[PDB]
Structure formats: C-alpha cells, structure tokens
Design a protein around this ligand. Structure first.
Ligand code: SF4
Lengths: 196, 194, 199
C-alpha cells in the first residue's frame, strides 16, 4: 500500500523517503511520534529489527519529509543520542520501493554485484544512487533481519553497467560499505538464484 | 497450549520462575534438575536470540521456590551461565498471555519499556501491573532483538507515570530506555509497531 | 546444483555424492564469490548459499571425494583473499548418512533414553563433532540447529544407551577442541523433557 512506487488511485505523489535507524526501540517510538506530529508524512514502518535496532521509514512530499526528519533528529539525538544512521531521498527510485518492507530473494534474472553494508540506510542510499547511475536491476535485498543489523542487496546488468554502479555505491556508502563483490559471469548453477 | 492459562480449568499454579542462561546445553541440565527437585510445570525451554536459553516454569509458591533453588546451583556451576532470573509468588493475570510469543496490539497514554534482559521485562511489567491501573498491550522477549526485551503499558497519564516509577525501581541498571507518549499520533494509535 | 530438494538425500535417487564441504564466512558478498569459484573449479553440488544469524554466510556442497576436495581448495583461496573471511570450514570425505537430513533446517525430535547436548561456537564444529560421534558410538542424532536464531552458534543432541552417549561425548570434545562451548549429559531426562527437550 504505502510502499507503492507510484501513488494508488486518488493519492497525492509522495516521492520522498525518510529512514531513521535507532539504537533504542523506545526512542524509536518517540522519534516516530515527533516526526508525524511535525509534518503530515506517511509512516511506512516502525520496527524492531535484528541487533535490537529500531527502523523507521516515512514518505511524503519533499518538504513534509524534510520537516518530519528535522523533528525526528532532535528527539533521536536527545540525551546520549540514539541515531545510528539516517537517510533522506527526495525522489526514491521506483525499483527500490518494493524491497523496503521485507527481504526479497530473486528466483530468476547478466553480471552481478553484491553489496554488503553496515547499516540499512547505507544499503538504501547506495542502491538508490546505483539505480540512477546505470541501467541496473535490483534483485535481492535484506535489511537487518537475520543478519545482525547488516544489509545487503544485489544489482544485475551488463558488466560495464554494474561496474559503473559499483563506483557510485562505494562513494555513497563511504565507510559504511563492508564488502562489494563483482561477478562478471556467474556459474550456471548460481545464475538467477544466489541465495537458497 | 493451555499451560499458560492465568487460572486452571487441574490445580492452581500461580508462581512463575524464569531463568535466563548464556548456554543452551546448561539450560537443558538446569531444567532437568529443576523439574526433578520439585513438581513445577515447565512452560518453555527455548534457545532465543543472542544465543541465550530461556526457561520458564510455574507451580505453587513452595514448588517454584524449590525448583528455582536447584536451578541456580546447576546454572551457577563452573564459570556460571545464569544471566538473569525471576521468581514471582504470583504473576499478574494480564502477563500470562504474553509469555509464550511476541504480541502486537491492534487497538489514553502509553509508556514503552526497553530492557537488557527478558527477566527485567517480566519483572517490571508484573510490578507495574500490580501497582498502577495499566494495561499491557505489546511485548517482545528476546526474539529478533538480540536478547533485549520491551513492552508497552497504557492508561491515563498519571497511571503510566505511576507505572514508570515502579518500572525504574525494579529494573535498576537493566532498564535501557523508558519513553512516555501522552497522546500518540493516529498512525501510532493502537498499533505502535508495524 | 541449487534447485531440487532431493539434493540432501543420504542416498541417490544419480551417482553417489558421499563427501560434504562446508564453508562458514563472515561476509555474504565474499560468500557468493567463494561459491562461484568453488563450482567453477570442480562440479560439486551446491546444497545451500545462506546468510545466517550473526550475519555470516553458510555454504555447503556435496560431491565425489575428489570434487569436494578441489572445490574447497578453490573456495579457501577466494575466502582468504586480502583479509580472510573464512570463519570455519569442514571437509568430510564420507559424511554419516544420518547427518544429511539435518543440514537444510533446524530439527526438533517429537519423541524418542539418555542424551547429550552439544553446543558449539561454529556450525562446522557441530557438523564435524556429530559426524565423528555418529561414526564412533551407536548414537542417534535427534535435534540440531545451525546458526539461525542462536547468533551463529550451533547445537545438536545425540541419544542412545548411556555408555554410548558418554563415549560420543568424549569424541565430540576431541573433535571440537576449543570450538566446544558446553556439553551436557543427562542419563534420565524427566518425562516432561523426554522426547521433547526444546519447546
Ligand atoms: S541476527 Fe539472528 S540471533 Fe541476532 S537477533 Fe537477529 S535473529 Fe536473533
């Protein structure tokens, strides 16, 4: 519903995505409350996830998310501070939307890169940048769950395309990048399905 | 599955013992010793996230008391494996249905309590439920959150404020964070986690 | 190598694939490249390629003895590039038949007299220990959980006559070495634990 790439019938365009990654679930709930009271952003999730972090996502118009996130950071940073990472994308890539809610493993798809990040925000941030840089396709993604708060995703395409994407991923992730693997020609046995 | 019933159809088994162990192997031995020592009823014996082992038992006060004595001796053997424990002569009725699995409420203030151990969560909630006119709405023990726990209590602001003081007292340093939201947003109304 | 469910069969439906290779990696991305290298080197059958709790990656393969040996050589090189990503590994030329049905998913026995519970720091240690025990003493593998929901740890249970599970315990300790976290032996579990130890 709220994760649609383009609006459902009758809804205004809400292209912007805000993501907050918090060390405290209790803090996360209060951060969400502050965000939604400040501006009429749409809450997409408010979730404890593995490692014991709390994941908040919201969408809205650019100005709405900007405003909600300002309120979110103030609360998130209160006291000892609980903000591990954050992301604001004014215009999140259409491919990205269907991967936010739950882990996705591809059945079928080409070269591939596998990107492994220290935070959920780094994965979403770098994937968005990658998808906008080269005509690559997001195939797999796992945000936090079952991998102790890490994240990873895969992108496929022509070899040069995924190499171009890989450069942008490195730049966008910075030190949040844990590992990036490129396989120009996966064995037949791995092609299409990398996780099974 | 009815073993988590607040009241029996069967004898009354009001008291709760919980043991939180760092070793699954030790956990099994602790359970065996506890159930041999006294006729407590085992509710769960579960590996949970972070790789700890969670034991719960219920019975008469004297029974849980004796089972728990035996549990501690074994749990404390060698380098020791007991991370936390709880013994309640009487667990609040609302609490029983939240022990077995994570619960998210479908549907006026709230406090959210976040603890370092499962026992701290159960201990806190029980005390709060016994002190203030609050309602337990959400709870998650260990699973998916690296061994911590959290729960939610609702009521009037004075109610959850009263609860919160009790929660702080019982948790001690096991309390990680406690948050109060006097009027949660519509999107957060009823359901806080989704 | 990936698709069909019979691939975990103790005996073939197909030629014999008695040997087992297991790789336990700290990086999911490296794990995929390791898998690719392994299967490019020799035609081993890949059984799984799985991120698991603690955020490590689990690879298992089976094949004829020589195939698994050569795939693992290729795997070790890639896993070790730059900084090693190999947490643990196992190569068994002849994996005990009982072991095959416990690889794909956690198993809890519903019903069985004496038992040992083995708890290891790595997945490979559990599989390695279990194999040694099943070959050495007349015991039965009942429960096993590899990594998932227990932060990368593993445990398994073996049942049998009391002297038999005691002998197994000795073998498990030897094979695990420092990878052993805890081992418990219960000669007579209470009836409430008998059959089901985990619930
Ligand atoms: S990673 Fe595995 S063990 Fe750690 S919290 Fe998530 S599920 Fe539990």
């Amino acid at each position: 519903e709220r994760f649609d790439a383009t609006p459902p019938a009758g809804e205004p365009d809400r292209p912007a995505l805000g993501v907050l990654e918090l060390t405290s679930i209790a803090r996360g709930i209060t951060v969400a409350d502050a965000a939604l009271k400040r501006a009429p952003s749409l809450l997409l999730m408010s979730r404890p996830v593995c490692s014991g972090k709390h994941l908040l996502m919201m969408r809205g118009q650019v100005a709405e998310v900007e405003e909600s996130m300002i309120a979110a950071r103030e609360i998130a940073g209160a006291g000892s501070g609980a903000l591990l990472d954050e992301l604001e994308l004014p215009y999140a890539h259409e491919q990205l939307w269907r991967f936010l809610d739950a882990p996705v493993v591809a059945d079928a798809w080409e070269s591939v890169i596998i990107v492994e990040t220290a935070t959920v925000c780094a994965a979403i941030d770098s994937a968005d940048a990658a998808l906008k840089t080269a005509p690559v396709v997001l195939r797999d993604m796992r945000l936090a769950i079952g991998i102790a708060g890490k994240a990873f995703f895969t992108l496929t395409g022509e070899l040069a395309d995924v190499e171009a994407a890989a450069e942008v991923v490195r730049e966008r992730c910075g030190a949040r990048l844990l590992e990036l693997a490129c396989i120009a020609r996966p064995v037949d046995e791995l092609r299409g399905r990398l996780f099974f």
